[PDB]
Amino acid sequence: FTMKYVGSIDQGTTSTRFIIFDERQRPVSVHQVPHTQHTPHPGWLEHDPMEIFRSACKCMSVAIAKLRQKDASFRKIEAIGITNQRETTVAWDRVTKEPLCYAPVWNDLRTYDITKKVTAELGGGDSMFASKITGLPVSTYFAAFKMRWMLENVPAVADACRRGTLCFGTIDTWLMYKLSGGKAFVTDVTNASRTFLMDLRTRKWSPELCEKLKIPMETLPEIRSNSELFGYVETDECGVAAALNERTPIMGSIGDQQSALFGNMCFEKGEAKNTYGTGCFLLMNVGEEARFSKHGLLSTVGFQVGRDGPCYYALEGAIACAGATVEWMRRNMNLFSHITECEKLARSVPGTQGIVFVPAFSGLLAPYWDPSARGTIVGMTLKTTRAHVIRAALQAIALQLNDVVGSMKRDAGLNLSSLRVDGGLSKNGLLMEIQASLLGVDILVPSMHETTALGAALCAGLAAGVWTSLEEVKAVSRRENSWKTVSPSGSAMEREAMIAEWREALKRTKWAK
Amino acid sequence: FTMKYVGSIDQGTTSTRFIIFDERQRPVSVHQVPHTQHTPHPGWLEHDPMEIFRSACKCMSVAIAKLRQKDASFRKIEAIGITNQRETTVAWDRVTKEPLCYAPVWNDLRTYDITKKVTAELGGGDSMFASKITGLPVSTYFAAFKMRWMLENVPAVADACRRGTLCFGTIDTWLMYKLSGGKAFVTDVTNASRTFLMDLRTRKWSPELCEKLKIPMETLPEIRSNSELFGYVETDECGVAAALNERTPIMGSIGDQQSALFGNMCFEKGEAKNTYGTGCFLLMNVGEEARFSKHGLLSTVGFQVGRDGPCYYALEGAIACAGATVEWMRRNMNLFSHITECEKLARSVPGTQGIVFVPAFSGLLAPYWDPSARGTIVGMTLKTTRAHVIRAALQAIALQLNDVVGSMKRDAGLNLSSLRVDGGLSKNGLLMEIQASLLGVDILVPSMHETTALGAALCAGLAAGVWTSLEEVKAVSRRENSWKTVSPSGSAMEREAMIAEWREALKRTKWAK
C-alpha cells in the first residue's frame, strides 16, 4: 500500500551507523557515531559496551529524524537488522543490566598466553585439533578465549559467574539485549560460529568444548537464525522509542562479513564476495554442507533465513595488507599524492616487466600462513619506476586472492561462478580488471556499495515481508541499483607467467627471526 | 722565476674537459664539452671519435683563452697529459686519417656473442683462461673483443685490414694520433692492460693472444710508460696549435681510473682509492709485483713513470650502481627531490631497522659476479619509510665495497692503510662514515677533487721536470691541497650484524633467466 523502510544498525570496529533503506534497497538516510578505542597495553584493544549501545541509539534517532524532514512518505521502520564486528566479546550482569568490564575486541592480543596453553594442553601441540567441529584454528580472535581471559583476569566477571548472573555475548547479543530493554538473550548462527563454542554440523553449542574450555553453558545466549523475530525495541535511550514512534521489531542479525556476503546476493554455492578494505576478507558460499579446509582457511556459516531454515555454509580467507599497502606507498614511500594517482600510475605501464612486490608487511595469511614473511621486492632494474611498483602491489593483492580462491575451490569441490566486490579499493578499476583476468570470472561491482548494512536490512526485511523471497531481493537489486560488470581481459599466457613469477617470489619473503 | 703550467685532457664517457694546472697543482682553468651517447640497439653504446677529438680541441682552445685573460704573461703550457675512459675502442684509417665507424664504448654489450665464442672455443669454457697473461677475465668490457666485433661486422673495417691501412686504439691512442696530425701511434701501459692483448708482467703485446683472438698486430700501437715523450700537438683543428702558441709536447697518458689512483698520491703498496661515480671503481696499489685474484677482481697496471722506471701494479674492483642507485631513487621512484635530501633522509633514522636493499639493478660484479641478481628489498614492515630505504641503499654500496676490499686483502696479502675517495658520492658524509666504520680505516676526502685530471698533469709534469720526483709531488700536494678525514666508529657488533643481514639478503637476489 504505502512505502516500506527497513533500518540497519552497522556496529563496526571504529564506529556505529544506522542506515535506513527503502523497499528498493536504496539507502535513504544515515547517521554515524564513533566510539572510543581503549588501549591499556601494546596489542590490547577494548570497547565500552555502553558507549556502543548509546551510539546505536543515537544513530537511529538522528537518521530517523533526518528521514522524516526529507521524506514525506516515511512513516515508520518496518524492522531493524543488526550487523556487527564479530568476535568482540561482552560480559555483563543479568540484574545490573550493565557490563562488568570493557569488551576485548576481535584483533586484541591479550588472549595470546591462553591460546598457547590451549594448543599445547588440549590439542597436543595441534592448533587445528577442534577445527572439524568449530571450523576454526585456535587463535586470539575467537570469543571463547576472550571469555576465558575475563574469568581469569577480571574479578567482577569471576564474581558474577559464581552467583549465576554472568552473561557472555558477541556484539549482536549485547545489542539485542539492551535494545530489548534486557528481554532477549540471543545470537545469530553466524556470530555464534565465531565463538569457538559452536558445533558447525549441528549449529548448537558443543557440550564437550564448553567443558574443556571451562565456559559454563549458562552464560551463553540462545542460537538462532539470521532472519526471524528476535525482540522489539523497548528502550528510549537517546530518544529512540520516540523517534521510531510505533512498535518496531528487530528481525535481522548477522556478522559483518556474512552480512556483506548476503548483501552481495551470494545466495548460491560457488558465489563469493571479497571486501577490498585495509585488508581483504573473501567469503565463498560453499552450499548446505560444511566444508573443512586443508589450507588453513576458516569454515563458517554464511547465512540462514528463518528459524531452522536452509543453512548455507562458507569458507573464509583474508589478506592483511590491501588498502594498507596503498596507503603505505603514499605516506611512507611518497610514491603518489592524490588517491587517483595510484590507478593512473599503475595503468601508465603495460606490465610490471618482471618485478614482484609481495606486500607481506605483517606476514602471510590465507593458504600459506607464514608470520616470518616480510614486505619484499624482487626483479628491479634501472628501468623499474614507481609505476611498476604500484602496479606490482595491485597485482600482488589480486594474486593472493587468486590463491585463496584456488584453495577454496579445492576444499569445496566447486567452481567460483562470480565475484562480487566492495570496499574502497574496489573503486580501483585496474585492480578489478587484473582480478577478473586472473580468476577468469566476471567481477560485479555494486554501485550501491553499503553491502554490509544491506545484508542486515535484507535479513530483517525478509522476516518482515518487505521482500518475500531471495529471488525478489535479487530482482529488486537488479532493477533499482546499477552494477558494473568487469570481465576477464588479459591472456592466459600472461596469467600463467604472472603466477609463475609470483610463486617464485614467495620463496624470497621469509625474513623475521 | 716564471709560473709553469700543465694541461690535462680528461676524456670521460659523457664529456671531455681540459684542465690547466699550475706547479702548485691548482686547477687554474677548465672547459667542458659534452659528446653524444649513441644507443642504436638496447645495451649498445657508441661514441663518434671525431666529436671527441673536436671536444678536446675546443676544450683546450677555450681554457687557454680564459687563462690568458687571468694571467696575461702566460705564453705556453709546459706539457700536455691525457686521461681517458678506458676499453672504448676506435677504428681508423692510416691514410684518410678518419674513423671507419663509431667507437663501441667500454660498457657496450654488442660483443656478447663474441665473448661466449672466445671463452668456449679458446678457454675450454674457462673465462679466466688468459688471466695469468692479461690480469683479466673474458668480458664484453675489454678492447680486443670490440676490435674483433669491428673486423667481423664493419665492411670499411675488414676492408682497411686487408689493404693494411687499419689502426685500432683505445681513446688515449686516438687522441694522441689526431693531436699529432697522424704522427704518433702510441698507448700507455695502463690503457694497454685493458685491451686483453697485453702481457701484464712484461707489458708487451702477447703474440699468442693477437694470433688466437685473430687480430693482426700491425694494427696495434707501441706501448710506452705513462710519463715521457709521446708526440707533439701539431693539429689546428679548433685553433688549438695557434692557441697553444708554442710547440707543445704530449708527455702524459693514463687510463682514468689509474689516473685517479696516481692523482690521489697512492704511490705505496696498500694505498688505494675508490671513485664513487655512477658506479664505483676501487683500485689498490699492490706494489712492484703483480697480484692475481681468487675472486674475479681484475689485475692491472697502476702506473709506470718513465721508460723502464718502476712499474707499480694494482688490483681493481667495481660496482655497477652507486650514484645510479641514488639517482634512481629520485628520478624513478620519487623518494626525494633535491640531492641533499638523500643524506638528510638517511640520517633522519637510526638505522634500517630490519630491511636490506640490495641495489643490483644490473647484477652483481665484484667478487660474487652474478648477472642474474636484480634490485631487491627484503624485510619491510608498515613502519618502513623511504628514509630507511635510502639509508639501506647507502649501507649496501658500502657493504659491497667492504666485500670488494676484503677480497683485495686476501689476493694482495696486504692491508689497506687508508682509502682516498673521490666522485660525487664522496660528498655524502653519512656514506663515508659508514664506509669508514666497515673498513676500520681512515677515509681521505680531498678538497681539490679533480684527481683524475691531476693524475695526467702529474705524469706530464714529471716527464718535463715541472716536478722532479714523487716526493716533491706529495709535499706540494700536502702543503697546497687539504683533505677531510673520516674516521671509523662502529662496534665490531654493529659491523658483524650488518654483514650477517647483508649476506642473508644476497641469497634472495637471484631473478633473471
Side-chain angles (χ1 to χ4, degrees):
Chain A
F1 36 112
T2 56
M3 202 94 208
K4 302 311 187 299
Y5 300 89
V6 176
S8 183
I9 296 159
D10 177 358
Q11 206 301 291
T13 294
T14 62
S15 58
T16 305
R17 304 139 85 223
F18 194 62
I19 304 197
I20 307 167
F21 291 97
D22 71 5
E23 58 189 65
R24 300 180 295 163
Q25 302 165 199
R26 292 283 184 79
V28 291
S29 190
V30 61
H31 194 238
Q32 176 173 187
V33 175
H35 60 276
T36 316
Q37 302 307 310
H38 296 98
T39 59
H41 311 272
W44 290 42
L45 182 60
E46 209 168 280
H47 298 145
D48 173 344
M50 283 300 305
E51 193 194 351
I52 280 178
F53 164 62
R54 278 180 182 115
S55 292
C57 291
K58 271 182 181 169
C59 283
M60 283 165 78
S61 47
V62 172
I64 292 163
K66 289 205 287 154
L67 219 200
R68 76 211 335 169
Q69 185 75 336
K70 55 150 150 190
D71 187 342
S73 42
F74 172 66
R75 167 187 163 180
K76 68 186 178 86
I77 283 141
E78 209 81 338
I80 293 163
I82 284 152
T83 184
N84 65 288
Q85 47 159 329
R86 303 175 298 175
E87 294 130 359
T88 303
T89 301
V90 196
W92 71 96
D93 192 289
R94 271 172 61 194
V95 327
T96 86
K97 270 138 271 236
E98 235 68 352
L100 285 336
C101 52
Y102 290 174
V105 172
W106 63 271
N107 59 326
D108 171 280
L109 292 184
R110 87 191 55 180
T111 46
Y112 184 63
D113 295 339
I114 287 167
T115 257
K116 299 312 191 170
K117 222 176 70 147
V118 170
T119 291
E121 302 191 5
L122 293 175
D126 185 26
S127 72
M128 292 293 302
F129 81 101
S131 65
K132 287 258 225 274
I133 304 176
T134 64
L136 307 177
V138 175
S139 184
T140 50
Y141 298 103
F142 308 121
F145 315 120
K146 312 182 189 314
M147 298 177 195
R148 196 65 231 161
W149 182 104
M150 291 191 264
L151 296 156
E152 292 183 8
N153 307 79
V154 178
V157 184
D159 279 329
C161 183
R162 224 81 52 21
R163 312 171 349 233
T165 58
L166 177 47
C167 286
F168 286 128
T170 48
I171 285 295
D172 59 310
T173 301
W174 169 244
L175 255 24
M176 289 190 273
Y177 178 75
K178 295 302 285 172
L179 245 23
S180 262
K183 295 191 166 193
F185 190 40
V186 298
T187 196
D188 61 79
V189 262
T190 61
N191 275 287
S193 76
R194 318 297 293 200
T195 63
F196 210 85
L197 299 175
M198 193 185 74
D199 194 310
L200 271 187
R201 297 157 313 178
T202 56
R203 312 166 245 125
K204 307 292 157 158
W205 304 120
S206 152
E208 299 74 4
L209 282 172
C210 294
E211 173 55 47
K212 290 172 181 194
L213 292 159
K214 265 306 201 159
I215 276 103
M217 303 185 62
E218 299 84 338
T219 60
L220 296 181
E222 192 182 331
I223 292 175
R224 294 223 203 140
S225 81
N226 294 295
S227 192
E228 58 189 80
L229 179 60
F230 293 99
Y232 294 88
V233 182
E234 316 197 6
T235 183
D236 197 25
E237 191 83 28
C238 325
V240 72
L244 284 161
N245 187 232
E246 321 248 308
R247 299 293 299 165
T248 311
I250 300 164
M251 303 192 87
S253 182
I254 174 155
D256 59 6
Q257 295 312 312
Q258 283 97 341
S259 189
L261 181 81
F262 198 75
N264 276 299
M265 316 295 163
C266 293
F267 301 135
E268 303 295 278
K269 75 189 178 211
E271 300 186 319
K273 79 84 187 178
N274 180 254
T275 298
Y276 287 93
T278 302
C280 286
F281 273 110
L282 201 145
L283 274 77
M284 180 183 289
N285 187 327
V286 303
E288 308 209 60
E289 159 85 306
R291 301 291 183 222
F292 294 92
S293 185
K294 282 254 165 281
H295 305 280
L297 302 180
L298 309 186
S299 309
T300 184
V301 179
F303 57 87
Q304 177 185 216
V305 186
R307 205 193 205 96
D308 300 318
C311 182
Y312 284 85
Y313 290 90
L315 282 168
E316 164 167 339
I319 89 198
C321 293
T325 300
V326 171
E327 186 65 8
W328 176 88
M329 280 184 300
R330 183 184 162 263
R331 58 142 40 195
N332 289 44
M333 290 297 285
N334 200 45
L335 307 187
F336 60 96
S337 70
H338 197 83
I339 53 265
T340 61
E341 278 184 36
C342 175
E343 184 166 4
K344 190 50 82 75
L345 283 154
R347 288 182 178 282
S348 68
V349 292
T352 50
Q353 110 193 159
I355 77 169
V356 180
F357 179 7
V358 185
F361 298 110
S362 48
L364 261 11
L365 292 182
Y368 25 56
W369 179 87
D370 181 347
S372 77
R374 286 290 177 278
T376 135
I377 303 172
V378 291
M380 293 187 298
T381 62
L382 291 176
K383 299 316 156 73
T384 311
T385 69
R386 60 187 173 138
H388 302 97
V389 175
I390 289 159
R391 179 170 193 125
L394 298 178
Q395 284 181 2
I397 287 172
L399 287 156
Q400 282 171 89
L401 287 176
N402 185 63
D403 289 340
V404 165
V405 165
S407 299
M408 281 176 186
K409 283 166 49 169
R410 337 211 313 225
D411 295 330
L414 20 84
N415 286 144
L416 174 66
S417 82
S418 60
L419 186 67
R420 334 267 153 97
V421 300
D422 57 36
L425 245 181
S426 70
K427 295 190 184 297
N428 186 317
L430 176 66
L431 182 58
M432 300 305 97
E433 293 171 10
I434 300 162
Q435 188 82 80
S437 299
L438 292 175
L439 292 179
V441 316
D442 278 340
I443 285 192
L444 280 19
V445 185
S447 63
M448 208 290 293
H449 56 249
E450 222 58 72
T451 36
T452 305
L454 183 60
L458 294 175
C459 288
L462 277 163
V466 174
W467 303 286
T468 52
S469 61
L470 300 177
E471 210 218 63
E472 197 209 335
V473 159
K474 281 205 282 175
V476 170
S477 175
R478 269 159 25 234
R479 159 167 50 241
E480 296 292 356
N481 295 324
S482 198
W483 298 60
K484 192 150 145 49
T485 138
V486 183
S487 279
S489 86
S491 43
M493 93 95 183
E494 281 168 341
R495 157 179 204 286
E496 167 218 287
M498 174 188 305
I499 293 172
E501 273 162 15
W502 171 247
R503 292 298 164 71
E504 264 311 289
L506 288 171
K507 303 196 151 76
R508 283 132 175 101
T509 55
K510 310 168 70 55
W511 191 244
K513 299 203 304 301
Chain B
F1 222 166
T2 65
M3 178 68 286
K4 286 95 169 288
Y5 290 108
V6 187
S8 193
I9 301 175
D10 172 8
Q11 207 302 284
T13 304
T14 61
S15 55
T16 309
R17 11 173 45 191
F18 194 56
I19 310 188
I20 301 176
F21 292 94
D22 59 18
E23 19 172 94
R24 294 170 37 265
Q25 303 162 191
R26 270 282 154 72
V28 279
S29 214
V30 59
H31 189 232
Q32 175 177 135
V33 176
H35 57 283
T36 309
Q37 306 306 304
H38 293 106
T39 59
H41 302 294
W44 291 35
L45 183 61
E46 252 159 42
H47 303 151
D48 174 343
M50 290 304 296
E51 187 187 27
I52 281 181
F53 168 57
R54 304 208 173 105
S55 302
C57 292
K58 291 186 280 170
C59 277
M60 280 172 75
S61 144
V62 168
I64 292 172
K66 283 197 307 188
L67 213 203
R68 103 177 5 144
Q69 156 169 33
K70 277 174 266 266
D71 183 341
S73 36
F74 165 73
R75 50 159 260 165
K76 73 165 174 155
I77 267 167
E78 216 78 346
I80 283 154
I82 284 153
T83 183
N84 61 294
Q85 43 158 340
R86 313 160 305 171
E87 298 91 16
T88 293
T89 296
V90 189
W92 73 92
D93 197 293
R94 197 185 83 204
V95 306
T96 75
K97 305 146 279 174
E98 214 110 317
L100 285 326
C101 53
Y102 284 164
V105 172
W106 57 279
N107 70 325
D108 170 280
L109 292 173
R110 83 186 71 200
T111 58
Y112 177 57
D113 285 352
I114 283 165
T115 223
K116 294 280 84 146
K117 172 178 146 156
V118 168
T119 293
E121 299 170 15
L122 298 171
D126 188 17
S127 75
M128 300 307 282
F129 88 105
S131 80
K132 264 177 72 74
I133 300 164
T134 57
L136 309 178
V138 171
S139 170
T140 56
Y141 290 121
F142 307 117
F145 313 106
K146 309 189 207 286
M147 293 173 204
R148 194 68 222 161
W149 189 92
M150 273 164 133
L151 287 163
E152 287 183 24
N153 311 82
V154 191
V157 178
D159 191 323
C161 194
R162 224 117 35 56
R163 310 186 345 263
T165 77
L166 165 65
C167 304
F168 281 136
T170 48
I171 284 286
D172 62 310
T173 311
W174 175 243
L175 255 6
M176 291 191 284
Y177 175 84
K178 300 299 307 186
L179 239 25
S180 294
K183 298 193 182 186
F185 187 55
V186 284
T187 189
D188 66 73
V189 279
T190 64
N191 271 290
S193 72
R194 315 298 293 204
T195 46
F196 211 74
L197 304 178
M198 205 197 62
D199 175 83
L200 222 221
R201 256 96 54 84
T202 67
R203 310 146 215 147
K204 298 304 197 203
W205 304 111
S206 154
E208 295 102 286
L209 283 169
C210 310
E211 206 167 70
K212 284 193 203 173
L213 285 164
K214 213 71 211 75
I215 275 147
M217 310 186 45
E218 318 94 48
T219 71
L220 309 180
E222 183 184 325
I223 304 187
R224 313 281 204 85
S225 90
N226 289 295
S227 186
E228 75 190 63
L229 180 64
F230 304 92
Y232 293 84
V233 169
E234 319 221 311
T235 189
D236 216 0
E237 177 62 41
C238 290
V240 71
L244 284 171
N245 192 319
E246 318 280 351
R247 282 247 297 186
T248 304
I250 301 153
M251 312 200 87
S253 186
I254 185 159
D256 58 356
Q257 291 315 316
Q258 291 96 329
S259 186
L261 181 78
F262 197 87
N264 281 294
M265 317 291 161
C266 295
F267 305 126
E268 301 263 282
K269 61 204 169 172
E271 311 185 282
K273 75 86 192 165
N274 179 257
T275 304
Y276 284 103
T278 289
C280 279
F281 282 105
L282 192 144
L283 280 72
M284 194 205 277
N285 183 335
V286 307
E288 335 219 356
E289 292 196 330
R291 285 285 101 86
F292 298 87
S293 196
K294 306 296 176 254
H295 306 289
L297 303 196
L298 311 176
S299 316
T300 204
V301 175
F303 59 83
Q304 187 189 153
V305 190
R307 210 138 213 143
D308 305 19
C311 181
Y312 282 69
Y313 290 98
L315 280 170
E316 174 173 321
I319 90 124
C321 296
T325 298
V326 174
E327 205 59 61
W328 174 90
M329 284 188 285
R330 167 205 229 173
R331 49 168 41 237
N332 289 38
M333 291 290 289
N334 199 47
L335 306 188
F336 61 91
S337 6
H338 182 81
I339 12 273
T340 58
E341 289 171 1
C342 174
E343 200 184 338
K344 235 278 85 88
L345 288 158
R347 293 180 176 288
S348 73
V349 291
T352 56
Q353 71 153 193
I355 80 174
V356 187
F357 183 3
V358 182
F361 295 111
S362 78
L364 276 338
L365 284 187
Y368 21 56
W369 168 89
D370 178 7
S372 86
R374 284 286 181 283
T376 127
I377 300 168
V378 289
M380 306 191 272
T381 69
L382 289 175
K383 282 162 170 144
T384 310
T385 72
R386 50 172 172 155
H388 298 97
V389 171
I390 296 171
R391 178 90 177 222
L394 299 169
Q395 302 195 352
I397 290 163
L399 287 158
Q400 272 165 103
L401 293 208
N402 190 75
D403 293 351
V404 165
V405 158
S407 293
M408 277 190 186
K409 281 151 64 143
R410 273 190 274 284
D411 289 325
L414 309 139
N415 302 109
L416 186 78
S417 52
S418 81
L419 183 59
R420 326 253 159 85
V421 297
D422 49 39
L425 253 182
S426 68
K427 298 170 183 293
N428 185 310
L430 181 57
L431 170 59
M432 303 301 91
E433 292 172 0
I434 300 170
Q435 189 76 79
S437 308
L438 288 178
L439 302 188
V441 315
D442 287 317
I443 271 169
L444 295 323
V445 192
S447 13
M448 210 303 295
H449 62 283
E450 223 51 84
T451 56
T452 304
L454 180 56
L458 295 176
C459 292
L462 291 151
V466 181
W467 299 281
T468 50
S469 58
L470 305 183
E471 294 300 308
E472 202 212 342
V473 164
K474 325 199 306 190
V476 169
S477 165
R478 289 204 67 258
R479 206 125 57 201
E480 301 282 6
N481 291 326
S482 59
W483 323 81
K484 211 133 89 77
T485 133
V486 174
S487 49
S489 73
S491 300
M493 283 265 54
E494 270 152 307
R495 165 165 214 283
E496 226 70 344
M498 205 170 295
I499 298 168
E501 246 186 12
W502 171 249
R503 211 143 304 281
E504 275 297 311
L506 286 169
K507 302 145 142 93
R508 289 156 173 92
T509 53
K510 308 142 64 78
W511 194 251
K513 311 172 279 292

